Amino acid sequence: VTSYIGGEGHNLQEHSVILIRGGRVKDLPGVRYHTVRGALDCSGVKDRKQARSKYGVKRPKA
Amino acid sequence: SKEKFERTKPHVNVGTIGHVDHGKTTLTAAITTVLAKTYGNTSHVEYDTPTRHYAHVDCPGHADYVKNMITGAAQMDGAILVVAATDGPMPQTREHILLGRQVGVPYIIVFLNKCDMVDDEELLELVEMEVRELLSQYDFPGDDTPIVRGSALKALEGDAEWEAKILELAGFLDSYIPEPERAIDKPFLLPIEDVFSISGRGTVVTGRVERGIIKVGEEVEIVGIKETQKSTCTGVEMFRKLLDEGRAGENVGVLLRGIKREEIERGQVLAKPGTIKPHTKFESEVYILSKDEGGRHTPFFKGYRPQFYFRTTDVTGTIELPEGVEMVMPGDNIKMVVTLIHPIAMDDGLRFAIREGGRTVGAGVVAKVLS
Amino acid sequence: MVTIRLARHGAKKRPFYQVVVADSRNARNGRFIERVGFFNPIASEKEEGTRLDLDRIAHWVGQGATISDRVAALIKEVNKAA
Amino acid sequence: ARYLGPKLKLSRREGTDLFLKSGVRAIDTKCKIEQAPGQHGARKPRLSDYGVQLREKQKVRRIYGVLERQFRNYYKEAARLKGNTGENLLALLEGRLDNVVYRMGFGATRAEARQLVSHKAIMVNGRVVNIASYQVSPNDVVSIREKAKKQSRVKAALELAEQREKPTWLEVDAGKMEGTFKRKPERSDLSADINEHLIVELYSK
Amino acid sequence: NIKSAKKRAIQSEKARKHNASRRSMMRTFIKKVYAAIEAGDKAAAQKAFNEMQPIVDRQAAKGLIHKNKAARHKANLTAQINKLA
RNA sequence: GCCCGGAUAGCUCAGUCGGUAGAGCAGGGGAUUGAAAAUCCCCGUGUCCUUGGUUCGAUUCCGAGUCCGGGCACCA
RNA sequence: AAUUGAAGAGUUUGAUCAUGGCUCAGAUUGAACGCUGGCGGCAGGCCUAACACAUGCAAGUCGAACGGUAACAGGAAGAAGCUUGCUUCUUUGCUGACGAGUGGCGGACGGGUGAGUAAUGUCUGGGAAACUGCCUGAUGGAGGGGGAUAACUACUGGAAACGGUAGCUAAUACCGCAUAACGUCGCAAGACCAAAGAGGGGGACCUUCGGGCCUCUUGCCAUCGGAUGUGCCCAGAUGGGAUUAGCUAGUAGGUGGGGUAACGGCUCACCUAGGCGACGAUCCCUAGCUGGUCUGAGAGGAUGACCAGCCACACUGGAACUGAGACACGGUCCAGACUCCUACGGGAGGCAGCAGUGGGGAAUAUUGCACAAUGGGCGCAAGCCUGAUGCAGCCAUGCCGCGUGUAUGAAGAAGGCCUUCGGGUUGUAAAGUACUUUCAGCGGGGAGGAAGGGAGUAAAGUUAAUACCUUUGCUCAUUGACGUUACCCGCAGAAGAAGCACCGGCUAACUCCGUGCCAGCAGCCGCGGUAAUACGGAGGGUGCAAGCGUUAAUCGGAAUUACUGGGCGUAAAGCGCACGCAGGCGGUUUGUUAAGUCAGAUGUGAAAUCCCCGGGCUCAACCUGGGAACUGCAUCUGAUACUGGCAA
Ligand SMILES: C/C=C\C=C\[C@@H]1O[C@](O)([C@H](CC)C(=O)NC/C=C/C=C(\C)[C@@H](OC)[C@@H](C)[C@@H]2O[C@H](/C=C/C=C/C=C(\C)C(=O)c3c(O)cc[nH]c3=O)[C@H](O)[C@@H]2O)[C@H](O)[C@H](O)C1(C)C
Ligand SMILES: Nc1nc2c(ncn2[C@@H]2O[C@H](COP(=O)(O)OP(=O)(O)O)[C@@H](O)[C@H]2O)c(=O)[nH]1
Ligand SMILES: [Mg+2]
Ligand SMILES: [Mg+2]
Ligand SMILES: [Mg+2]
Ligand SMILES: [Mg+2]
Ligand SMILES: [Mg+2]
Ligand SMILES: [Mg+2]
Ligand SMILES: [Mg+2]
Ligand SMILES: [Mg+2]
Ligand SMILES: [Mg+2]
Ligand SMILES: [Mg+2]
Ligand SMILES: [Mg+2]
Ligand SMILES: [Mg+2]
Ligand SMILES: [Mg+2]
Ligand SMILES: [Mg+2]
Ligand SMILES: [Mg+2]
Ligand SMILES: [Mg+2]
Ligand SMILES: [Mg+2]
Ligand SMILES: [Mg+2]
Ligand SMILES: [Mg+2]
Ligand SMILES: [Mg+2]
Ligand SMILES: [Mg+2]
Ligand SMILES: [Mg+2]
Ligand SMILES: [Mg+2]
Ligand SMILES: [Mg+2]
Ligand SMILES: [Mg+2]
Ligand SMILES: [Mg+2]
Ligand SMILES: [Mg+2]
Ligand SMILES: [Mg+2]
Ligand SMILES: [Mg+2]
Ligand SMILES: [Mg+2]
Ligand SMILES: [Mg+2]
Ligand SMILES: [Mg+2]
Ligand SMILES: [Mg+2]
Ligand SMILES: [Mg+2]
Ligand SMILES: [Mg+2]
Ligand SMILES: [Mg+2]
Ligand SMILES: [Mg+2]
Ligand SMILES: [Mg+2]
Ligand SMILES: [Mg+2]
Ligand SMILES: [Mg+2]
Numbered sequence A: 001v002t003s004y005i006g007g008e009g010h011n012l013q014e015h016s017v018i019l020i021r022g023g024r025v026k027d028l029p030g031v032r033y034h035t036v037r038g039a040l041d042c043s044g045v046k047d048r049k050q051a052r053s054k055y056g057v058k059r060p061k062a
Numbered sequence B: 001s002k003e004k005f006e007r008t009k010p011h012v013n014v015g016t017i018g019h020v021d022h023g024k025t026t027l028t029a030a031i032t033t034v035l036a037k038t039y040g041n042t043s044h045v046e047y048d049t050p051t052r053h054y055a056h057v058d059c060p061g062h063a064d065y066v067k068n069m070i071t072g073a074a075q076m077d078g079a080i081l082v083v084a085a086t087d088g089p090m091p092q093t094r095e096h097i098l099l100g101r102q103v104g105v106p107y108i109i110v111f112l113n114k115c116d117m118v119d120d121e122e123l124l125e126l127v128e129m130e131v132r133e134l135l136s137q138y139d140f141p142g143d144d145t146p147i148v149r150g151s152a153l154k155a156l157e158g159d160a161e162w163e164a165k166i167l168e169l170a171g172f173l174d175s176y177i178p179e180p181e182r183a184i185d186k187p188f189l190l191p192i193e194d195v196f197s198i199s200g201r202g203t204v205v206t207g208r209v210e211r212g213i214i215k216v217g218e219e220v221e222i223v224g225i226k227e228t229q230k231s232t233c234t235g236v237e238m239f240r241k242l243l244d245e246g247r248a249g250e251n252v253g254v255l256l257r258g259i260k261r262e263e264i265e266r267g268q269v270l271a272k273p274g275t276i277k278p279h280t281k282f283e284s285e286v287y288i289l290s291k292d293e294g295g296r297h298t299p300f301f302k303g304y305r306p307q308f309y310f311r312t313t314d315v316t317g318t319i320e321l322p323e324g325v326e327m328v329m330p331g332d333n334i335k336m337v338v339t340l341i342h343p344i345a346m347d348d349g350l351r352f353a354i355r356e357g358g359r360t361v362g363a364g365v366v367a368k369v370l371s
Numbered sequence C: 001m002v003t004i005r006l007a008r009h010g011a012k013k014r015p016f017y018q019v020v021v022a023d024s025r026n027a028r029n030g031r032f033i034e035r036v037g038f039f040n041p042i043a044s045e046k047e048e049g050t051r052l053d054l055d056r057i058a059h060w061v062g063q064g065a066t067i068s069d070r071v072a073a074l075i076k077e078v079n080k081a082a
Numbered sequence D: 001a002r003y004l005g006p007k008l009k010l011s012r013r014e015g016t017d018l019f020l021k022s023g024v025r026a027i028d029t030k031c032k033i034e035q036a037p038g039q040h041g042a043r044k045p046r047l048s049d050y051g052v053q054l055r056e057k058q059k060v061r062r063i064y065g066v067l068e069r070q071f072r073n074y075y076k077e078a079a080r081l082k083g084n085t086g087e088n089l090l091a092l093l094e095g096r097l098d099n100v101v102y103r104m105g106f107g108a109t110r111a112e113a114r115q116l117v118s119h120k121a122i123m124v125n126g127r128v129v130n131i132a133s134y135q136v137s138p139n140d141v142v143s144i145r146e147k148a149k150k151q152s153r154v155k156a157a158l159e160l161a162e163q164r165e166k167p168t169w170l171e172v173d174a175g176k177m178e179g180t181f182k183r184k185p186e187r188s189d190l191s192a193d194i195n196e197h198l199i200v201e202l203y204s205k
Numbered sequence E: 001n002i003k004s005a006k007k008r009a010i011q012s013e014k015a016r017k018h019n020a021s022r023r024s025m026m027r028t029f030i031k032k033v034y035a036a037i038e039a040g041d042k043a044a045a046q047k048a049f050n051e052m053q054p055i056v057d058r059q060a061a062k063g064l065i066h067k068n069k070a071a072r073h074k075a076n077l078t079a080q081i082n083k084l085a
Numbered sequence F: 001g002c003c004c005g006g007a008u009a010g011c012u013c014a015g016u017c018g019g020u021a022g023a024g025c026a027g028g029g030g031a032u033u034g035a036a037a038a039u040c041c042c043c044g045u046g047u048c049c050u051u052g053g054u055u056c057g058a059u060u061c062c063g064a065g066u067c068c069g070g071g072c073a074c075c076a
Numbered sequence G: 001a002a003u004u005g006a007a008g009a010g011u012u013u014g015a016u017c018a019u020g021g022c023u024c025a026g027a028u029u030g031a032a033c034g035c036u037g038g039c040g041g042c043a044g045g046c047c048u049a050a051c052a053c054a055u056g057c058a059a060g061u062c063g064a065a066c067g068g069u070a071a072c073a074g075g076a077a078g079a080a081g082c083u084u085g086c087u088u089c090u091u092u093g094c095u096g097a098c099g100a101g102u103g104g105c106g107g108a109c110g111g112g113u114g115a116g117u118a119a120u121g122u123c124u125g126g127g128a129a130a131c132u133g134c135c136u137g138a139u140g141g142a143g144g145g146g147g148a149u150a151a152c153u154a155c156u157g158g159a160a161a162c163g164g165u166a167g168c169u170a171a172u173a174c175c176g177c178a179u180a181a182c183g184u185c186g187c188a189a190g191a192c193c194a195a196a197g198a199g200g201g202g203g204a205c206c207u208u209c210g211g212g213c214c215u216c217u218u219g220c221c222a223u224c225g226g227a228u229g230u231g232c233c234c235a236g237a238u239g240g241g242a243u244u245a246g247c248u249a250g251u252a253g254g255u256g257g258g259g260u261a262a263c264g265g266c267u268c269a270c271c272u273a274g275g276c277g278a279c280g281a282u283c284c285c286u287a288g289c290u291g292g293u294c295u296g297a298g299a300g301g302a303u304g305a306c307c308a309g310c311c312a313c314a315c316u317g318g319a320a321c322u323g324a325g326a327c328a329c330g331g332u333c334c335a336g337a338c339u340c341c342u343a344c345g346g347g348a349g350g351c352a353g354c355a356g357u358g359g360g361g362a363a364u365a366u367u368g369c370a371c372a373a374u375g376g377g378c379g380c381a382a383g384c385c386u387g388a389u390g391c392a393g394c395c396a397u398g399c400c401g402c403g404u405g406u407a408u409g410a411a412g413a414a415g416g417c418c419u420u421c422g423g424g425u426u427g428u429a430a431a432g433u434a435c436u437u438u439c440a441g442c443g444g445g446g447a448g449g450a451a452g453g454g455a456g457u458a459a460a461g462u463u464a465a466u467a468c469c470u471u472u473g474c475u476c477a478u479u480g481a482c483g484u485u486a487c488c489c490g491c492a493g494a495a496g497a498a499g500c501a502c503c504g505g506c507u508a509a510c511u512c513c514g515u516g517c518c519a520g521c522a523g524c525c526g527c528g529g530u531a532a533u534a535c536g537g538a539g540g541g542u543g544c545a546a547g548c549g550u551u552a553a554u555c556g557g558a559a560u561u562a563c564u565g566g567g568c569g570u571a572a573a574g575c576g577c578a579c580g581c582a583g584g585c586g587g588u589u590u591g592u593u594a595a596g597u598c599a600g601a602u603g604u605g606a607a608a609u610c611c612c613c614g615g616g617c618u619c620a621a622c623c624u625g626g627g628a629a630c631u632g633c634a635u636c637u638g639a640u641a642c643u644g645g646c647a648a
Helices: B024-038 B068-074 B091-102 B123-137 B160-176 C054-061 C069-077 D009-013 D049-064 D068-079 D085-095 D097-104 D110-118 D153-163 D196-204 E004-039 E042-061 E069-084
Strands: A020-022 A033-035 B011-014 B053-058 B078-081 B107-112 B147-149 B195-198 B202-208 B219-223 B228-232 B251-255 B269-271 B282-288 B317-320 B333-340 B351-356 B359-369 C002-005 C009-011 C014-016 C020-023 D122-124 D142-144
Touching: B011 B078, B024 B053, B024 B160, B068 B091, B078 B091, B078 B160, B091 B123, B107 B123, B107 B160, B123 B147, B147 B160, C002 C054, C002 C069, D009 D049, D049 D068, D049 D196, D068 D085, D068 D196, D085 D097, D085 D196, D097 D110, D097 D122, D097 D142, D110 D153, E004 E042, E004 E069, E042 E069
Parallel strands: B011 B053, B078 B107, B107 B147
Antiparallel strands: A020 A033, B195 B202, B202 B251, B219 B228, B219 B269, B282 B333, B282 B359, B317 B333, B351 B359, C002 C020, C009 C014, D122 D142
C-alpha cells in the first residue's frame, strides 16, 4: 500500500514499522490509507492541543 | 524450578575482577568444585558454605564488556581480585581495580593465580608486593588486604595441598567480608540487569533487590525506558530455586506476568506502584574528576553529551550549565541541569556516574526532579 | 437412563433450577425430553416458591425414570397431604 | 453522569426557565436570562427544524437531569407501551424518584432532591432507595427516614414548595415528611409548555 | 499415554485372544457344513449342521454373536441343507 | 549484551587517503500577476548524524553515543 | 394484551428538470487504535496458525466379586523393662481398613475445536427391514462339575521402558454337563440354546464345630414388554461458477451365494444395458448446518460469536480390536513427519481438555479456589473422583445503575479573551457562607444460596423374631469455595473521582491571533494565493459522558437488482430479420376428476431467544412464570367457482 502520513512533521524514515488505517485522501490518487499517528514507531505530532485523540498526542502534562 | 530455597546463612555477592586469561573462571569453578566436595555472559555460580551463602558472579574480563561488568560489579559486595602471579599488574587489572573503586565495592581479596607455574620465593612474592602497592594506588587497604596464592587448575583435580589452599580462600572470604547491611524497610525497588524468557513461563527479569521485599503475587510497576507498565509477580527464584519473599540485597529472578520479551528491556525497574516516577530532566551536584582522579583534563560547555549511568544502564544526556558560569573546569564541584534522551526512574539524591570517552568523567548525585 | 433432575440456570449468584426429565448422559443444561415445573432456592416466602407438575412426574416414575435426590426432596416438599 | 456544571447557563440557552436554579429565592434576574447564551448570545439563530428539535429535547433533558442514553431508553420504553408516545415519555420522566421527591417539596431544586435520594434520606414503602432512576409505581408512599428527617435543609426546602402549583397526582403529609404518590400524572397536568411532539419527532428519524 | 486405566488395553488383548479363538472355531464348524453342502452329501450335511447348531447358539448366548447372525446361519444354512435333502 | 556497517544543504549525490564543504535539481528575494507558471534581475539557504579527543587546524584521524541495517550471543 | 407501522440531505448546471452514481444522518460489533479513566451489577473475552508446545492437573471407583496384605490403625500368643501390667516389644489378616493384583463398571458421557463436508451433513415431514449397557413392568430359572491364570515365591533378561522360563492359589473371571419355554431354526415333526452369588441378622434344629437351616437386601440367566439412545430409508428444502456439456462400469437393474443388529452393489458370481443431465449431472471455487443474531414498516439482505440441537475431527495417513454403544481426544497396532531420552540394544511424545508458553496477528485473560451447590462416574451406603460445573483474578469489550456534591453567593472581583475600549463575556461560575455523605477509605454487625448425610429415638411394615432391614416422624451434633460475601450500622471530612469530539454547508455550536495554494485539513462538497467562521493556537459554544473519537464490518437509507416495488424512441438498455424444438401462456359450452386452490380437524413446529401480561434482584440491565408467537410441513374429511388433467 501507500498510506498518507498526516499531521505536521514525522519521524518516519526508510524503514520504521508503523500502523495503517483506512481512509482515502481525495487529493492523492493511489493513496487510500492513513497512518495511525502516535501508535508504534510513529510518534504523535509535536505541540498539538486540539483534536489530540487523533495524531496521538497525550494530554498536556503541564 | 522445584526445590525450595531455605533462608539460612546470610547471602553475600562476590565476583572476580582480573585480567583477561588470568584464570578468573577456572577459579570461580574451582571454589565450587572444592566446597561441593569437602562440604558435600556473566555466569552467576552459587556455593553454600556453613558460615555464609555466597553468590559468585564471574564477569568476562575483556575490554568490550566494561559496561555490563559495571552493573555486574555494582551489586557485588566484595570482589576477588584474581591476579596471576606470573604477570602481576596488567592494563585490564588496573582497569577493573579502578572500576571496582568507582563502582565503590567496599572489600577486596587478592588471589595470586597459577602460582605452581613458577618455583621461586622472590619472584612471586615480588609481584605480590606489586599488587599490594597497586591496591595502595587506589585508596584500597593494600597492606591490610589478604593476599592468597595458589593454582586454580590444581584446585580442579585432587592435589589436597592446593584444594586446601583454596578452601582456606573461602576462609578469608567469610573472615574479611562481614555480614552485609540490607534495606529491608522502605518500599521495594529492583533494577533490571538481565531479561530472560523461560519456556512455558514467560519473561524473567533478574538482579539484586535494591530494597524491600517481593511477596509472590504483589502488584508491581515497571518504570523506566520507553514508558511504564503494570504487572504482578508470579514466582520469585534463587539460582533455579523457589522463593517466598524476595528480600533485599540478593540477586533474584522475578517472573513477571503478562509481559513480552521485547517490551521490557534492560534498564527499567520493578518499583512498587506509586513509589517512583520516571524523569528526563534533573538538577544534580556534579563533581568533575581531574587528571589525578582519572577523569577529564579539558574544559567543556553546553552541548557536551556524556553518559549518565544509574542503577544499571547509562543514557546520553544534554548538559545545561547555571548562569554565572561560562565553562566547567576539570576537578570542580558544580551543579547542572541535565536532560537525558531516555527517561529513567529516579528520585532526589540518587547517586550516579557520568562516564564518557570510554572512561569515567565525574561522579554526581541527583539534586532535584524535573522531567 | 431417563432421570428427573434440576437444570441449574438463572443468573450468577442467583441460581434458578428447572427440574426436567432427561437422559443421564445429557449435559446438565443440555438436551432433555420435557421440563416439568421449576425450583427457586432464593425465592423465599412470597407469591411463588416451587411449582412441580406431579402428573407428568408420576408418568415417568412408572416409566423407570430415577428421581434425583433434590427433586425427590421437592416431591416430598409439595407433599401429598400438605 | 450528572451535569454538575453552571446550572444556570443552560437556562439561558433554552431561553426559558429550567428551574435548575429554582433555589430557595424565587425569580432570578441574576444571570441576564434569554438574550445571553454566551459570547455570541446577541445572535438571532436561523434555527433549522433539526435545531428546534434538538433544542427541545435538550430543554426537556435539562429539566429532569436525565442524560442522552438513559433518555433514549425511556423513549424506546415509551414506544413499546400503549396509549400515545407523547404522554408516555413525560409520564416515565415524571415517574423518576428524584422528580417525585422534588414535586413533594423534599428539597429546593431537582438536583437537591437527587443529592437527597442518593444519600439514603429517602425511603419509599419502608424500602430505602438510592437510585434516582427508580420508577415510582402508582399508589406508593415516599417518605424521609427519621435519622435524616427534618434535618435543616429539608425544612426550608419544603417551605419553598408552598408557592409552587403543587401536583394533584401526588400528596404530602407536611407534618412528618410522609408523602404519597398516587395516579400516573395526566398529560394536561405537567408541562403544557415543553413540547413532546418535537421529541417524538427527533427519535423517529 | 500414561494412564492407570491401561488395564483395558492388556485385558482387551487378553480378551481378543480367547474371543478370536472361539469366533474361529465357530466359523470353521460352519465351513465344515458348507463343504458338506458342496459335496452333495445331504446326510453328512444334516450331521454337520447338528454338530454346529449348539455351538453357534452357545456362542451367540455369550454375546460373541448377536443371535441375529446365529439365526441367520441357522436360517439359510438350513435352507440349503434341506433344499438339497 | 557485543562486533560490523550506513548517516554530507529541500531531494539525489561528488568530495578524503587534515588546510577553510561543492554538483545537479529544487527553494527564497526584487520585477510582473488576484496569486502563480513562463520571462528577467539576484542569492546556498549546510549543527558535513550528535559530542569529545589528538592536533595551529579534523567532514576528512581516534573515542563514547543516538537512529537504522546486518551477524553472533541470550532458558530463573 | 401479544410486531400502532415506511422522513430525508449534499454533490453534475449559469439556472432548471430528469436520469444516475457517490456521500451523510440510524442501528449494530466476539471489534481494534488514539486520548482520557472513580465504583458497582450482569454478560463477553485467539474471529489469524486445525501453528509447534515446557509443566501441573483434566477419569476413576467398588474389600457388600476374589486370593491377598505392601503400609497404617486396633486386637491377640508371646515378649522386656521396671512405677508387674506401667511400659518395651516380636509374632498375628484375626478385625478397622487399604498400596500393588485379578474381576465388574465407567472410560463411546462430560470438555474442545470447526480442518474436512455442497450432502455420506443439516432442517422439515414421513417411513420400515433394526438394535438398545444402565433404569423399569410382567413371568419363570438360579442344578450340578472342571480346568486355568495374575498376584505371589525361585531363578534369570534389559540402562530404562519392560519382561522370560518353572512352580503355588482364589472368584460374580473362564469352561463343558444337567436344564428349558409363548426363545432360535423349521411347514411341522423335531433340534438346539443360559446362570453367580454375595452382605446383615437369627429361635429351634443341626455342628467332622468349615457351618448347615430361617429370613430380609442385592446382584445373576432367559423371554416378552416400556422408556430412552442409536443405525437406516425416502421426499422437499439447503452457496457461487456454463469463460464447466456431458458424466458413469459396481456403473443402473436383475438372479443367486456370502455379509450386517438391520434393508441395500453393502460384497463377489453370472445376466440384461442401462442410470444420471439443461427443473444444471459432472468438474471448479467457497462453506460445518440449524434454532437463532443484526438490520429492516414488511418482503427481504447480511450472518450463524456466546446459549442449545445435530454433524465432523482428535499430530498426519490407515487399520482393526474390546464393548450395549467407538471403528474410539487424555486406548491398541502400523507407517510417516516432528521433538526428546539412551548404557544406543531400544524406547517416549501428541494441549482443536483447563491454565500457560513461543509464533502468527490490529487484536483477546489466571500456570486461581473448591467440589459447598447442580450434574456425571463408581459404590449398599459412607465417601472418592470430576479444569463439567460453581465461584474468584484479569481486560471499559458491551449493556445497565450511580457517583464526581447541593443550596446560598455581585464586588457582578482577579486572570483570560474580545471590543466602537463605552463595555462585554467567561459568570453564580470561583472564592465566601450553610449543609450533605451515597460511592470508594476505616471499624463493627451480617443474610441467603443447605437440600442433605451422620448419630440417636419412637412408631408402622418385614418376619419364627420386640434382631437386621426399608419407610416416616423426632433429638443432638453438624456440612460454604465464593467470603476481609450481599446488606445494615458507625467514623471523618467536599473531602479521593471529567474527559473526548466538534463549531463553512450537510449537522447542534463563533470569534480573535499566527501562516500565506506553504504548513495543513478533508465523510461528501471542498478550504488555504496576506482580513481563513474550513489550517494551527487561544477564547467562547455545542454534543456526548466514564467514556469520547477514529478505523474495519453488516443492514438501513438504496424503489441504485424493483417478489412486494424499476426500467428499455433520445439518459444504460429491443437481438439486423425470421423460422422454430423444449419452456411459458391460451377462446368458448357441457361432464368428470380434485392436481393446484380454499375451508375444517388432528399431529408436529425442542428449550431458550423475539413479542405481551405478571414476578424477583433497592432501580436497571439480567433472571424469571404464564401466554401468544414459531409466517412451516404432513396426513385426514370437505368445497368446487378459477386454473390443470381426461372426455364430448
Ligand atoms: C564508574 C562506573 C560505574 C559506577 C557507577 C556509579 O558509581 C557511583 O556513582 C560511585 C559512588 C561512590 C561513583 O562516584 N563512581 C564514579 C566516579 C567516582 C570517582 C571517585 C569515587 C573519585 O573520588 C572522588 C576517585 C577517582 C578517587 O580517586 C582515587 C583514585 C585515583 C586513581 C587514579 C588513576 C589514574 C589517574 C590513572 O592513571 C588511570 C588508570 O589507572 C586507569 C584508567 N584511567 C586512568 O586515568 C580513588 O580511587 C578514589 O575513588 C555510585 O556507586 C552509583 O550507585 C553507580 C554504581 C551507578
Ligand atoms: N598451568 C596452569 N594454568 C592455569 C592455572 N590457573 C589458570 N590457568 C590458565 O588460565 C586459563 C583459564 O582462565 P580463563 O577463564 O581463560 O581466564 P578469564 O577468562 O580471564 O577468567 C586456562 O587456559 C589455564 O591454562 C594454573 O594453576 N596452572
Ligand atoms: Mg573467562
Ligand atoms: Mg452509562
Ligand atoms: Mg459549480
Ligand atoms: Mg484428579
Ligand atoms: Mg494380649
Ligand atoms: Mg486396594
Ligand atoms: Mg464338588
Ligand atoms: Mg462367569
Ligand atoms: Mg414357529
Ligand atoms: Mg440377494
Ligand atoms: Mg443371503
Ligand atoms: Mg473451512
Ligand atoms: Mg497440532
Ligand atoms: Mg464386537
Ligand atoms: Mg477416550
Ligand atoms: Mg491431549
Ligand atoms: Mg489451552
Ligand atoms: Mg460435586
Ligand atoms: Mg477583566
Ligand atoms: Mg463503602
Ligand atoms: Mg434457611
Ligand atoms: Mg437449613
Ligand atoms: Mg447457610
Ligand atoms: Mg436434619
Ligand atoms: Mg448550524
Ligand atoms: Mg480539522
Ligand atoms: Mg489572519
Ligand atoms: Mg481554526
Ligand atoms: Mg433494497
Ligand atoms: Mg431505473
Ligand atoms: Mg442509449
Ligand atoms: Mg428491430
Ligand atoms: Mg409447445
Ligand atoms: Mg379457459
Ligand atoms: Mg387437493
Ligand atoms: Mg420454541
Ligand atoms: Mg421491579
Ligand atoms: Mg398457543
Ligand atoms: Mg375443472
Ligand atoms: Mg375445465
